[PDB]
Ligand binder design. Structure first.
Ligand SMILES: COc1c(O)cc2oc3cc4c(c(OC/C=C/C(=O)O)c3c(=O)c2c1CC=C(C)C)C=CC(C)(C)O4
Ligand SMILES: [Mg+2]
Ligand SMILES: [Zn+2]
Length: 322
């Protein structure tokens, strides 16, 4: 069984890795084994003097604080975003653009970006006067919490994977990780996309042909949009993968809508299981959210992302046809 898993982990650089098989083959440890593979592949353990045992211990503790009883925002989603961010970082147009520390931040941010998600939305947590909304004053409630949990777990026994970074390395990475995860709040999508559009229109490229990023503001904005693309990458994946993600988000949405109805509240869009239109909503989401973003990303790394954008367009057509 370990040999099959190791075979499937050979695809870690490929879009459309079969993350669900890896979850099964790893005994519900997709986040740990994919993170470990990626760190090996990028030589991050040697670069940052990360002890192997510390890495596994942190990864397992972090994976544990994703909820196995949440159908979408679980450890499989986290592994998927890590792996998708890992592939997006390897695109030719970005070669040698980001430092080792920035690659570490983006991968680490992807791994913690939804930890301890309870499977309800920010707006539900606000409307139900939840403790989380109360702690974070109704602003990026989930996103602030994922960051606080992800960083806090570094303090558990033999969990500080950043113990051999310099103080300035830690401080720079923490800030970058915060900037990235806070940008995954969907209420920020439009401002993030508008900013990425502006950057593509004024895009500058080096003599080697690679994207030129002058300053923190441009670098962090590309890393924020990269992780945001990886977060919204389900509809760019091969259809058998995309369909399982759709099934899982609808289970989680529907269960929020039951809670909402049980409490007298109006049902949030896509959460009413007596008035759903699964296929229509996927097309709506692609047309108004996912495709505008992925088309803008494709222009930034043109033509590196043309197969991913083509798969998205085919998957949109297929859902439309139904
Ligand atoms: C109200 O705006 C909408 C909306 O109008 C339709 C939507 O539709 C979806 C559809 C989704 C998924 C969706 O989730 C994306 C991933 C989130 C994560 O990992 O946290 C959504 C939406 O979130 C969504 C939102 C955004 C929600 C809020 C509260 C601003 C995830 C996976 C796939 C299969 C792509 O389907
Ligand atoms: Mg999230
Ligand atoms: Zn997410």
């Amino acid at each position: 069984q370990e040999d099959v898993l190791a075979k499937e982990l050979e695809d870690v650089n490929k879009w459309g890795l079969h993350v669900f098989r890896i979850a099964e083959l790893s005994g519900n440890r997709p986040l740990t084994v994919i993170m470990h593979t990626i760190f090996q592949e990028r030589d991050l353990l040697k670069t940052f003097k990360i002890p192997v045992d510390t890495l596994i211990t942190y990864l397992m503790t972090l994976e544990d604080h994703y909820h196995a009883d949440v159908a979408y925002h679980n450890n499989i989603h986290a592994a998927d975003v890590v792996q998708s961010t890992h592939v997006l970082l390897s695109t030719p147009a970005l070669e040698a653009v980001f430092t080792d520390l920035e690659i570490l931040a983006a991968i680490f941010a992807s791994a913690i970006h939804d930890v301890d998600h309870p499977g309800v939305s920010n707006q539900f947590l606000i409307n139900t006067n939840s403790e989380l909304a109360l702690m974070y004053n109704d602003s990026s409630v989930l996103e602030n919490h994922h960051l606080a949990v992800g960083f806090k777990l570094l303090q558990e026994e033999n969990c500080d994977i950043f113990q051999n970074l310099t103080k300035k390395q830690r401080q720079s990475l923490r800030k970058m990780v915060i900037d990235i995860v806070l940008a995954t709040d969907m209420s920020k999508h439009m401002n993030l996309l508008a900013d990425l559009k502006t950057m593509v229109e004024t895009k500058k490229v080096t003599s080697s042909g690679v994207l030129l990023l002058d300053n923190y503001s441009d670098r962090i904005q590309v890393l924020q949009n990269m992780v945001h693309c990886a977060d919204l990458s389900n509809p760019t994946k091969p259809l058998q993968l995309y369909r399982q993600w759709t099934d899982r988000i609808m289970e989680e949405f529907f269960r929020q809508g039951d809670r909402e109805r049980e409490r007298g509240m109006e049902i949030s869009p896509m959460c009413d299981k007596h008035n759903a239109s699964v296929e229509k909503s996927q097309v709506g989401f692609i047309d108004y959210i996912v495709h505008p973003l992925w088309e803008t990303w494709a222009d930034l790394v043109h033509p590196d992302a043309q197969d991913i954008l083509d798969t998205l367009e085919d998957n949109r057509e297929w859902y439309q046809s139904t």
